[model samples]
Target: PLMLDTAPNAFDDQYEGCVNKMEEKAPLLLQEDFNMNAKLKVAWEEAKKRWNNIKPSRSYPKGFNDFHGTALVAYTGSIAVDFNRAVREFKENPGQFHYKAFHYYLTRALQLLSNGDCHSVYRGTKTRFHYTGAGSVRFGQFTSSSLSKKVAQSQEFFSDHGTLFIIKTCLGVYIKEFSFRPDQEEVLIPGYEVYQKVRTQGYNEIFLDSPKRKKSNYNCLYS
Candidate 1:
């Protein structure tokens, strides 16, 4: 059998920590005034700058136009470079990771990217999630998966910790990235308040138990 030992929540807390700080800066970061955007133009320059410093190497998703959307470039490159090297560098020397600046740009991008709304998207991750009950996910990190369950499981599922998460994102939550040659109809979800929907939205899940198809009024991955 093929194997991929991935943790969807890898550094999720750290990521949440970064986003929480982003919330603190939201007043200015999400500011919509023109002069302020002019003031924040430096942020974009440095976003690419920060992205450039630790940028990972790899071809982007297939349908991606090189010049069409730089945000995807940032998302594709920054969200995950060779996470192998990124993880190592971040652990070895925190400065080498530069997650703060990267998150700033990414968080801002998610807020402003405005592609539109979606019904649902899926994410697959290792089953070991923290801070939760049997059938609920209190919180989660940003991860990508496709609209197609087959594609998500076939591609992103890691056998070691196999589990799937289905989510419906807000307008900014649907980033156009998964249409590669292998063609995963993928969508990226931010660490924004997307997780909060599980409880409040009354989304349901079906875990094929022996006899009865147990349904839970939660959108999280169940163990």
Candidate 2:
């Protein structure tokens, strides 16, 4: 686990609690396929219930497990406006926040947009534990100077792990992953530069790229 200045308790006490608790229960909050039509909405509502009821197993990740827990922490590092608006949009209209792969991809994107750059390198072959959708994440081949310090700090937990992947998502800073000496490039889309600016400005000045845009208005999911 990463030792962060803004701990989990701090986030829940100040930020997470500010949003609607019911927003987490929204049917389309983490899904991609959505429609305003009554039939689909009802169906999705049922699906959301089932999905929520699901528990973590050897095969599947928990709906609200360590990954989500940590991801939320990283999310807090984003500007307050972006973080608050994300919750608001989801509450007012759930259909717009859909992501095809749900938590994994969306979590990764949030971390990157907030402060985590797309940075990662490849290590040699080995028996490894990995996320199902790790390949889809837009990690950079090299770490930036700004991120190097956090990368060094992360080593206290996971040692000798070569290059580190650190990011701030929402309002939290996260040590996403680590890898040995490796190779790679910018694996993100063209428009990423816009979101990347959030790291410098601290808040997303561009309403369009900011995570705070209204429902069905912003495209955080890069496909």
Candidate 3:
């Protein structure tokens, strides 16, 4: 008897799809994409190194699934300027490898790293964002956020007239758990799906953050 029914949890189904795609595409990222590989390697290498060094007491998803989960964190959470730049490059070229890398790795990683609970995360940016109420949000190829509202609202993250987003996520994983970071950031995957959608742009604010000034971490997004 051939019988089929709807999947109970689509999130788990997406993870399976991602794993299949990752396995299929890993070989395609050959010597030609060495430049891309190097940036991707930064994430996996850094994540693996940190994981081994940190030696978490809890068990995680095993096999390649576990491998890429931490790597996902490395890419999104760590401050790799080249990798960040690579995202735009891939976007510009419509290269599927790196572009899907962000989405695939994130989907897989969140499955492992998530605490099975909910969290409220925040990101402040000058960039305009559109939302159809409770719909998916693509915050660049990969997105960064903070556990603290104050940190998210800091001048480093926000520009004048910038809006701050208060996001509710179940897939929140602590940055320190994956990579070595000084900031109190909690990174998420590329998209946001929540109801906390209302734009807030400062009509008349008093501030200035020029590139010539050269303050660190400023313009983390568009720089």
Candidate 4:
């Protein structure tokens, strides 16, 4: 089986060197390289448009600065590559892919291309974020709290088509957003009964219960 989700100990020196080289060349690619810039713009605008519609009324920044740093790191690098790979898969096999999923993957590609800051807390501070969940996440939405040192907000809902999970982990230091799609064989959570009852019936949407307080068990698996 392909353990696509397996976490690695660290990045090899060669990969790090390659990324450093890319970083050095990225600025020139953004400036003098107009062709690359145009391509990047297409990916950026498409991702931004879909993200804008789904995003909460009150949320984080949504502009150039949002993706103004290296999303590459020992932990996150592999997942970023996978995200881009999926973009290609959807392009080749449209019937098997979801448009929403493709939009997310493309947005991730822009972040890596622009060297966006996927981990910065505010304007300053180099803090990390962690979340409690299963599966590989693409994106997340969260609510903040001043009192809790670390906060995790999670919601699992079922739609006519597929299940959606939104999870975010934050500390006073930083916040990270992640999304998940549970495996078919996995057991459901306790409150999943509520979702089953409302299965056939549908409504515009409903909010999940508030996040509970807890220390994160997952390591720095996510950015």
* Cα-based TM-score, every candidate: 0.45, 0.21, 0.59, 0.24
Model 3 Cα shift for residue 144 (angstroms): 2.0
In model 1, where do residues sit more than 4 Å from their true spots? 1-71, 77-97, 126-131, 134-140, 155-160, 177-182, 194-223
Off by over 4 Å in 2: 1-24, 32-146, 149-172, 178-223
Arrange candidates, best TM-score first.
3, 1, 4, 2
Residue-level lDDT of model 3, residues 1-223, one tens digit each, is 1111111111111333245556566444423344556665555656666666555555566543544645554664453445545543443444443434444455456655656566667777765444433322233334567878888778877765565666655545565455455575665633322222344235422121110111111111110
> Which residue ranges in model 3 land beyond 4 Å of their true spot?
1-18, 24-37, 42-47, 62-66, 76-92, 96-103, 126-140, 182-187, 190-223
Error of 3 at 106 (Å): 3.4
Residue lDDT tens for model 4, 93-190:
43432222222222333333322112211110112223223233222111112112121111222223332222222211121221122121111111
Query: What is residue 66's positional error in candidate 4, in angstroms?
Result: 9.6
- Give the CA lDDT, 0 to 100, for residue 179 in model 4: 16
Against the reference, the lDDT scores of all candidates come to 0.39, 0.27, 0.47, 0.25
Index of the highest-lDDT prediction: 3
RMSD of 2: 16.2
| Candidate with more favorable, higher TM-score: 1 or 4 | 1
Model 3 CA lDDT for position 72: 56
Candidate 1 structure quality by residue, lDDT tens digits, 1-223: 1111222322222232244454455335334322333323443444445445333544433333222234344455433533323432332454433343334444445544445465466555545333232333322234565677777666345334445556555532454432222266656654323233232212222121111112222121110
